[PDB]
Amino acid sequence: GAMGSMERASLIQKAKLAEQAERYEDMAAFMKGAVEKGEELSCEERNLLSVAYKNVVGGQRAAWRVLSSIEQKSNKGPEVREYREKVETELQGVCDTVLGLLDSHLIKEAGDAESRVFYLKMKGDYYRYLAEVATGDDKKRIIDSARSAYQEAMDISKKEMPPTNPIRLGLALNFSVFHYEIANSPEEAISLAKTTFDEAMADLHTLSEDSYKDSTLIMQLLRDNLTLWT
């Protein structure tokens, strides 16, 4: 890879610079390079990886939705479809790249609950993004791949993490969105968000001020979704 000649520490440094410069494609390329060094990622480094690719795929998804809507309204020549397909293929490529990093070899080397849950949550999210654009023979298998990753993450998080842990909360938030938006399971979505919120509320008393702030931010996003869905 193109980052093979750069020091791991320099890749991490440049990823942070790229974030400050809002150069998320560069940030992702630097973090891919860092992962490919073969060493486990620290907490901070995992967050850099996540931010980078979330921003890249976020832009692609937003563009895809714009184009897909124009295409739907068209149903003129092949151009709308062609360009939607172009964006779709690029999105799929980014998701496949992230999934590839997780599979080679981030997940298998992740032994601590925090790391393993983080990566399995990512795996669910990127299969979810593939599901958003999927049609044809494999869509069910993509959906099930997302579900399976999220479910393993949920099982570990319930056993190993407090109900206020931000990763646990974020996982629950995203899995509930999977249920609502992908799996046609709004009741499951609502039940997951509600139970997550309530169990977190009950554990807030254990937290410091700074931990309280983070947990309550995510709880408010759960509440916001519950409000939207009910």
């Binding site: 979330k54 999210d125 931000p166 938030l173 983070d214 995510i218």
Partner: peptide, 9 residues
């Protein structure tokens, strides 16, 4: 679509 988790603060 429903909002998923945003970037951390």
């Amino acid at each position: 679509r429903t909002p998923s988790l945003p970037t951390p603060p």
